[PDB]
Amino acid sequence: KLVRLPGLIDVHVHLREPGGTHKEDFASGTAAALAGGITMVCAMPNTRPPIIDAPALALAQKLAEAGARCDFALFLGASSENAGTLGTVAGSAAGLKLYLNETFSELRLDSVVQWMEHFETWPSHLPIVAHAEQQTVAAVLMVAQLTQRSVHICHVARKEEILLIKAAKARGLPVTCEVAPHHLFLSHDDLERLGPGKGEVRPELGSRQDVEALWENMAVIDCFASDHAPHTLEEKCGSRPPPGFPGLETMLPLLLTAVSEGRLSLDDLLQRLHHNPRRIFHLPPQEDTYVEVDLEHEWTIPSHMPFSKAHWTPFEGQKVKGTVRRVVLRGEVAYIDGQVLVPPGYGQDVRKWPQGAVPQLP
């Protein structure tokens, strides 16, 4: 007997189009999403060209509208040159993305003053999310307080980070955060198996104590999000391995396994993959949209999942329980038992729906 879930939302995916389409494109990435029981994705701006200006956004929107099989919103990315220039297109984006650590020359910010400039100029009602590790979390929280607005912290990976966020919440500060599945289900203990190439990810895999702290502090975690970051095996195993794991197809099965084991409830999962993503990002409902899962089916994750062009997975060999059987998206069957049945272009830009605009004072 199947359990019906609402359409789940992944607010952190890298779909690689434009410019990296050997790694993934909108059509393949959204197929991966559907197979993972996800019906709406928020795509990150670190493409080539990066989505850091109106023309790049315009290109990305058309590519997504033509290629996406599920619904989507696109992030804008903060650069060292675009603060104060995104006003006219800001409302059309998922939100603004700040890359506060490593980064490519284009999204690199070299001074906290540039962060402040973005917080001051980006419309105050629209989401801001940050890649912020370790002390960077504290630093970006400070910038948010100086400018008296909220911030969302991507992929919390460490005890240090989740305890900091916990303390901020206890003081009533407007901060929310997300955790990715690799930081709940993999740790240092897995690096021997993965190797130094495949195992490369940012934030890096944590200690068993980091992983335990995230579970113990589940109340502090607002969202789960995959940080789906596909790279080919050639790239991961090559001389300069880029960081990132694919994750869309494995996220829900891993979490359903955890639910089956009583590590969190079905409600806890649905807050973090549906209700909280909606409310933090003001994403609209999807009419006639639902996911049917089989919670009894035991299987072992294989060396690669069917849809992502990454064609590998760091979870290979893990035993899980729970599988996506059927997805319906806006009244059409989108996925059944390993077959995606909606074509590239079926997906729509949710920010163009009347219900998908973020409310604001005139």
Chain contacts with Zn ion (rule: CB under 5 A): 12, 131, 154, 227
Question: What are 130's strand-pairing partners?
Answer: 98, 153
Cβ–Cβ < 8 Å for 131, 89: no
Told to judge if 25 belongs to the known catalytic residues of this protein, a careful annotator would answer: no
Residue 171 or 240 having the CB closest to a second copy: 171
**Least separation, in Å, of the C-beta of 144 and a second copy?**
9
**Which residue in the set 15, 56, 151, 164 belongs to the binding site for a second copy (CB under 8 A)?**
164
Window 33-52: residues binding a second copy (CB under 8 A): none
Residue 220: contacted member of Zn ion, a second copy, none (CB under 5 to 8 Å, by partner type): none
Q: Is 163 in the site for a second copy (CB under 8 A)?
A: yes
DSSP states along 281-314: HTPPP-TT-EEEEEEEEEEE--SS-SS-TT---T
**208 annotated to bind ligand:** no
Say if residue 131 carries a ligand binding annotation: yes
Q: Catalytic: which of 71, 210, 227, 349?
A: 227
- Annotated ligand binding at 154? The verdict is yes
Do the annotations mark residue 275 as ligand-binding?
no
Q: Per DSSP, what are the bridge partners of residue 71? A: 40
User: 54 or 112, CB closer to a second copy?
Assistant: 112
* Residue labelled with tokens 């890359």: 99
Cβ pair 67, 124 in contact under 8 A: no
Per-residue burial over 75-89, b = 16 or more CB atoms within 10 Å of its CB, e = otherwise: bbbbbeebbeebeeb
- The interface region with a second copy, picked from 37-45, 137-145, 285-293, 307-315 by CB under 8 A, is 137-145
| Residue 169 marked ligand-binding | no
| By the rule CB under 8 A, 116 interacts with a second copy | yes
* Residue 22 labeled ligand binder: no
Return the SS3 of 179. strand
Of 332, 349, 358, 357, nearest in space to 34 by CA: 332
* Interacting residue with a second copy among 54, 112, 233, 266 (CB under 8 A): 112
| φ, ψ dihedrals at 40, nearest 5° | -150, 130
Residue 139 vs residues 45, 93, 136, 159, 199: alpha-carbon distances, Å = 22, 25, 5, 17, 27
| Residue with Cβ nearer Zn ion (283 or 340) | 283
Query: What value, to the nearest 5°, has the Cα angle with vertex 290 and ends 289 and 294?
Result: 165
Least distance between a second copy and beta carbon 167 (Å):
5
- Nearer Cβ to a second copy, position 3 or 163? 163
Q: Which residues are catalytic?
A: 227
- Which positions lie near a second copy, rule CB under 8 A? 100, 111-113, 116, 134-143, 145-146, 159-160, 163-164, 167-168, 171
